[model samples]
Target: SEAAKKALNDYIWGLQYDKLNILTHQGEKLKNHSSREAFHRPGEYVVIEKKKQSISNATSKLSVSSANDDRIFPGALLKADQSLLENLPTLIPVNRGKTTISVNLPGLKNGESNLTVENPSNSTVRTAVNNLVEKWIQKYSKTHAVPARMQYESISAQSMSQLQAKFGADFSKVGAPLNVDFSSVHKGEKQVFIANFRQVYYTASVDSPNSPSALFGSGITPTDLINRGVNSKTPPVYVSNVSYGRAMYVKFETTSKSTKVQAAIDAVVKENILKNTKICAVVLGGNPGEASKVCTGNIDTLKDLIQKGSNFSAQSPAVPISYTTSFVKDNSIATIQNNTDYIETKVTSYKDGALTLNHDGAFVARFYVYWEELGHDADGYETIRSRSWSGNGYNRGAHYSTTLRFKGNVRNIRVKVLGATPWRLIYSKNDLPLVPQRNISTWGTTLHPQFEDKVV
Candidate 1:
């Protein structure tokens, strides 16, 4: 709601004109001794009225001709006789300097009246308003560096329902609702995709002309700076000897308790992020528990709320089975469907006190799904490799998916996690794709509409 309010504010403010003030002048002007025309300034206070109209929120489709172009002059009449202002219409150039254009409405002599544009579509004023909105959305996205890529992963509906019962029981009306269908794929028919993944590497080293003794006080009680080796005067050794490697890792492996998964999902939604909440559908993995049924409705609502702030049962997924293709990829489903030997099981191994994944299966992937919240102080950033042990080619992408061939079947998967930050997920077969629009729903008083309006 706060975000919606901010968007509305931005939209409203974005419509302001360079040489114009829409604020009405207050009170009747007192009679001046030198004035004889009822103290009117004659055309100085002419009202160029405009109306607001809704348009597709998608920025790509927005055009200059639309009535909602807020930067254009809403109501301009170019007369052949008054040709001087013809080429210079009163439209604000978004990236350039400002222009001034105002007109005194004709034929309304001798009285104070309100000039209003009733139909926004037919009126020039609406075009100006729309232009302004387009500029704002463009600027906002540029400033935020919003990503267009998202990959949706699957979670068990049973787990979600259990989570709802544990955390949302008292607010049953708001707590994830009942009869939720979680076992359905999106229109694209892909599952187990990376909702969104980012990777960055950090390397810590000491520069030359610095030694540990000068920095660490001859290996005595070291100050914070000395420990950091920032103040060393001698040639320094660039040693990557920390317990944690130079690279940091994070993951969102699912918890055995349904409650924790629900909490993490809700936390993402609350962060007002793009990817985590924009899930089109979810596939529930593992055996069905009584709580699984509720997951579908809740996850759907969460997705809708993220994309377009609202909730509805009709928009929920249809299948409520043990598994679906929503979060699981087509290749994975084919593997399970064709292979009589394949089982709905988890594959993993323990290494260095960590349960490392061995193969791709429903539950094994599910662990990675909620990997972020599993271990305290555990860095999920590690090179995931399939040991050359050749068997079923399930999780491994083909040579087309990676570069090196004999690198122990290593995949080029990368992930970055910001704890409690709202992340977005988008999909594109190509390297880049058009940014998606934020759908605004009027049904349940969503925060998105309000926030967008405020900011634009």
Candidate 2:
């Protein structure tokens, strides 16, 4: 009993000792988890918060002399579009504790709103449309490659009399009816001795603009990226569906002594092809307009309003100056903005008639083709010889979303795949083709198994 107690204590101590190592091993297995841990391990950082200036209260009136750093991400800023910056969410870092960094949201001026939050009182339909369009372009550029079509021909049928004649007395006691009701037989009736054959045919032509510039350049416009003189704008890229053809055959008699009735069925399969499948299309551009030069300078005014609770509703402000960034990036803005293919906006007056407010003036970004399918290789050894006859149909993949907005100043934009990374895309079925062996010398050999065993 004493030895057992000592063993239990050792087991408990071992668990505690191994906990850290086990946790570290698991962290390494998950890439995202590892990245998050690594990002925070470096050191402490700062977090900043900005809001609107307030004037509704006697003692809470906020001043406008405040200003903050213009720190920005080089990648995002270099590609920032004048119309995009104001509609985007911004996050700033602020130093709080030696090992802690507080997250901050930029504030809006007296009549302005933060790019991060989608405030019902501040967002507009026009800006929303622009944002939606930008997102669509991003999605299109990545999945621009077209899909190929596959055709298949199959014949399935049975004749009751022929089966009876072939099996003789063996067929009668095989739990099969002597004869099926021919009068009751309709177009879709079973055991009708109808040997129906159908030929489904279609051609798939995928136009992929493998232009080096298109693939290499970042923030390229959709219109510019599309090849010229290709009529791509109209028909775009499309996949076809199976087309139907006629089914015909001959009936055979089931008498005791009979001559074999050989019949062949010819069917044609046509593909219903539509042009301009338009899986996705995007437009990217940049300009420094009235929207650009005024955004960064107005942060102080928005902060003042938040601190004074001017926009506060209910017991407290629905959003505090401290919470501006969270509201800006809440995703609701993206949803409402994406509903319409066009942009919408609303204008209001603020700052005691000193400022003209355009809280919800969103730009438009239109998008389509959220889902698509890919083709698969055919199985079996005959696949190569029967290239036109045997292969699986196209399989649709998962849906993805694209996000866009006006960021002010001249901006370059890019569109690409979201869920799957580059390496995964390169290794997908579409990227790899089926090349069956041309020689079958190894078939039926002692070292090689039968055709059935080695066919896949």
Candidate 3:
């Protein structure tokens, strides 16, 4: 019944009638017998209701942009062009009971505005207005995104003051006008601040020009002097005055080997003593050889040479050459590869009086082979006859063959090569080579063999 009552009320309040009709109808039963039934029905009518289109209690407020306003969100002031709010939808549903929209006028220093809906009772109306305003704000923000201004403090007034407070006279001695510029920085932006300091050298000054002693005390000496006539008295009086001269001060001098010459140069450069000078030389002294002078174009080149000594130049006079020995081993006899210059030898076999030595091509100046027999004599002491053969020239090919006869059945053979600059001994195997006993009569008659063989 309530549903019916509501339907009737809605029809009455929401609809308009252009025309109405009331009528009753009787139902008739049709058949061959002709019987009649009675019924009553209400007639239909055509009606229309007026549409409610305007929203009430929705308002807007706009403020002018100002410097004091927040740049990120300048309230809803209408822009001068009025494009932000142009063509806004007017027929929004006002399901919410009351609403107001406030807008800050655009184009102002820091203008802002807001939209408010009072007593919003309907969810649909509240949602619609909120969505529309949110979309408009987003669209407007894209083109009107404002960068925040930087907050700056005077360096001379603020930072310098703090520095002066901390360092006192030390900061004051650095001179005046400690200035800084932060125009390149913006709010929420990160930046680096660089402070540069200039070093000043203070040389004592002379009070009077005629005072030669004053100049000497100030570390200045005269190159020439004028002498007055001597007096005729028993004790002669002699007077001298300074002529023209230049001052000389020795900043650094060292005889210690541990002293760094580059560090001295760096100190001189940093002190500004070589600012306008061009010629510079590092004079090395007290060494065993003649003292050498190292010339440089500028401080930069001097530092580079010092840091990269040997690596930078083929002829680095200051750097020493270090000697190291390296051995190469090759078991198979083969022609020398293009880049190889070292020869290694292995005694592959020995038969009859001919000995076969396998080697990688000629890499040294000469090759030598020594054979000896090891046994006990009747005196119950060991007897040894160490004899050797020298290849007068280098073996150019892969194999070196030699013939020799031993006085007795040889129990072992030793072979070695003396080549390679600076003298490096290469062994065919990893074991230690045999060394012959030194013969003092010939000064040096024994050779150390790199390869040795023991017969069973």
RMSD after CA superposition, every candidate? 36.2, 39.2, 48.9
Model 1, position 324, has a per-residue lDDT of: 12
- What's the CA error at residue 49 for candidate 2, in Å? 87
Q: For model 2, how does the per-residue alpha-carbon lDDT over 1-456 read when each residue is reduced to its tens digit?
A: 334434422332232212111111010111121110001112221111111111111111011110211221111111111111122222211111111111111221232221221221112322332343334335442443222122212211232323322222122233132233333221222212222122111111111212212111233322332232112111111110111111112121121111111221121122222111111101001111311111121323322321222211112111111001101111111110100011111111111101010111121112111111122235411111111101112221322122221111111211111112111111111211111211111112223222111111
Q: Worst ten-residue run, lDDT, model 1?
A: 241-250
Cα lDDT tens digits, model 1, 1-456, are: 334434422332333232111111121222322211111122221111112211111100001211212222222211111111111122211111111212221222332112233322223433433333344344442443222122222233322222222221111222223323333211111122112111111111112212222212112332322343322121111111101001100112231322234345545543222233223322221123321222223344544423431211122111111101100001111101100011112211111111122211111111111111111123433223223322223332112112111111122222211111132221112211111211111111112111111110
The best-first sequence of candidates by lDDT reads 3, 1, 2
Tell me each candidate's TM-score.
0.14, 0.12, 0.14
Q: Whole-model Cα lDDT per candidate?
A: 0.21, 0.18, 0.25
- Which residue window of length 10 is worst by lDDT in model 2? 320-329
Worst 10 residues of 3 by lDDT: 234-243
How many backbone clashes does every candidate have?
A: 75, 74, 44
Q: Estimate the overall C-alpha local distance difference test score of candidate 2.
A: 0.18
